[PDB]
Paper text:
Alanine racemase (Alr, EC 5.1.1.1) is a fold-type III pyridoxal 5’-phosphate (PLP)-dependent enzyme that catalyzes the reversible racemization of L-Ala and D-Ala. However, the alr gene encodes an anabolic alanine racemase Alr, it is expressed constitutively at low level and essential for providing abundant D-Ala for peptidoglycan biosynthesis.
Like typical alanine reacemase, a homo-dimer of AlrTt was found in one asymmetric unit. Each monomer covers full-length AlrTt (Val1-Lys383), it contains an N-terminal eight-stranded α/β barrel domain (residues 1–244) and a C-terminal extended β-strand domain (residues 245–383). Although we co-crystallized AlrTt with PLP and L-Ala, only L-Ala and the phosphate group of PLP were observed in the active site of AlrTt, the pyridine ring is not interpreted due to lack of clear electron density. First, side chain of the key catalytic base Lys40 forms a hydrogen bond with carboxyl group of Asp317’ (2.6 Å), disrupted the covalent bond with pyridine ring that is necessary for forming the internal aldimine. However, these interactions are disrupted or much weaker in AlrTt: His205-Arg224 (4.5Å), Arg224-His168 (3.5Å), His168-Tyr268’ (3.0 Å). One L-Ala molecule is positioned in the active site pocket by hydrogen bonds with main chain nitrogen of Met316’ (2.6 Å), OH of inner layer residue Tyr287’ (2.8 Å) and Tyr268’ (2.7 Å). Presence of Gln360 and conformational changes of Lys40, Arg224 and Tyr44 destroy the hydrogen bonding interactions necessary for stabilizing the pyridine ring and phosphate group, result in weaker PLP binding and low racemase activity of AlrTt.
Residue numbers in the entry:
A (entry chain A), B (entry chain B): 1 to 388
Write the structure that this text describes.
Amino acid sequence: VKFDGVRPTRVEVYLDAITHNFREIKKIVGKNVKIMAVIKGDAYGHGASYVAKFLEKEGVDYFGVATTEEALELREKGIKTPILIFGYTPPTQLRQIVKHDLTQTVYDIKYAKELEKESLKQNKRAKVHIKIDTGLGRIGYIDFDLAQKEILEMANMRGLILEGIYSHFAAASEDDRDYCKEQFDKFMNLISSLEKKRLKIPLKHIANAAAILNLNYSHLDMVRPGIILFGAYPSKRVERKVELRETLRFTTRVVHLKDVPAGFFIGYGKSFVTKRKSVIATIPVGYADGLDRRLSNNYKLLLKGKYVPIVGRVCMDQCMIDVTDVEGVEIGDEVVIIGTQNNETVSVESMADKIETIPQEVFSRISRRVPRVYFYDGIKIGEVNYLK
Amino acid sequence: VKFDGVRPTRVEVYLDAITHNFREIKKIVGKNVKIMAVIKGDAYGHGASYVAKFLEKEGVDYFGVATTEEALELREKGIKTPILIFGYTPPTQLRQIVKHDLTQTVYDIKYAKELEKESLKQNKRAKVHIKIDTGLGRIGYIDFDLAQKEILEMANMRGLILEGIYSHFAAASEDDRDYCKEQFDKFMNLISSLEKKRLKIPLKHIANAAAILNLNYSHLDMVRPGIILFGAYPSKRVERKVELRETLRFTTRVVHLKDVPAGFFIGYGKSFVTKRKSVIATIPVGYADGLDRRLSNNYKLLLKGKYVPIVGRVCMDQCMIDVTDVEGVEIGDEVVIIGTQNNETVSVESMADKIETIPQEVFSRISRRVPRVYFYDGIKIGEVNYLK
């Protein structure tokens, strides 16, 4: 329909497409290789609640998130699946991760002790994964000699469970195979040293989407697909042997149509002027919704399967488009910003290229003001308006 | 304190600075000119609930929001101040705006008739403000002959209250005096025509923030400050001295520290490498939080009042800073992304410049995941976490 209870400007999340892309990852990896769905940044702007709910039905082995509150949000909504927090959970918030049984990242002994203390205080055991810095220079142990010592102590701390150990590739998306091979070996060399001290950590993992496609050796015990679950690739230097489906459609509606003559100025600073008789539509989406202002006078959106350019500057809440070439335009016609419309697509990757970034940042730009509508087998099954 | 119950990456909102900036508008305009506080985009990322709550106590005459959902959000938190919705409320949602006495922007008879029908059905009257396009080419009547014809119809529509009439400047920020007088004159000429048809409208307004300070003639009955209320100037080219106080501080904490030698690669794609023995810190803020990825290797955050460069790529939830030259850096030290720290400011305007946009987009990019902590008179009075 033209309009409904939900805001005109919206994100349509296709849950059956996410579960499909998830099933594509299982084909690439072995039958005994576990999958951790990275759904950080609110499932890359898709809404963690619903995405986690539907991946839990699909039988996912783990979830990956960036923060404590991301991990807790999932538990608040009845997610039973194990969850791993990549980031630092401050000492002041340690009670919560122990209470709701959340896996925590650890790469120093003082922090492990503080966690153990809270684990013993609640008479539960805090699952932990050890992060190793094999080249990325971000987080994890860099002194491998120190790492062995502290990791071996943690193995003897009864308040903890030393379930996992992991690292992260620095240039897998850039396809520096020599560095990926180099990072992998360092990682395995630390594990060999630990296994020689009678310590078998059940979950060794290192591969993100880039290495999952290319580096069959990096699979290990568990694999960490993120953006790839949402119908996009991390870069152009990947094999793309999987068949991805479109998971998100960022859409809005025609809210106003005017006929104007030539020499008619549009937008702030009179940055655009018509060179002909034109039909201008206004659409209630702007930069506060996640439509980058740099697309002012250099992007085309989809309307009835035709490309329509943004004319004038992108405002905070709205922008104008030239619809002169499109016949039969009406109030409440759908306008697609990201995604497919009638044998035509303005993909998330195309948008990322135009503003010199990657699909992950584009998805994360879609703001709180944009409600998420959810679909499964073609039918709408729920919605979230964050303004509520 | 180093850490607390709130996420380390946060936005500190200073409500007394917002009210102070509002009072700066009060000094500029008369005692006889009303003030509509524009707080669309969740109060430019400050949080509409708390900001509206305090501007109401301050005695603001009206609020301006972009969308229906923003207006209902205010009403649902108990706000009684009159609220204007700038954007388009679709025919499907007209019941709500009549029920909660929200003011609706109208610029066509068909829509007026639709709004009146619901208004009559509830035995109520819908307050409306008429948008006039005088040059911006965004929304409103461009046909001033029609404008008059349809407005006189609306005056004889007993289910509508024809409270306001307004337009908007296209280049008040670029300081285009001629085009501003051109816009104003058209508006006032239209006003004069309507009076001769025996029709007066009590709330005439046109001045956005730039026109408030530079164009004294443009004050009329009401004025519409937005970005000025949040400590950012609406133009670079402004006259009139004003005392703007800093309303927002986008801050994070040091999470990891490490010593590294020269030739140490940092971040994705090995984009940065050390030229010396260095001390590098990791901070839990990324582009999913609104820190633009294009700041990778070309911005400086503030730590202990000193500038520290961002090194390597900005990740989705984190990035690294070079802290070598800063002494006594410990875990939990405050890093300011936007705002003031020890006689030193990294303003929202400076970042807007850096990523070639305007302050409003910078504030708007600060994502759902970043909690808002609120202050009044130096005391922390509350907090909101949208993950909850």
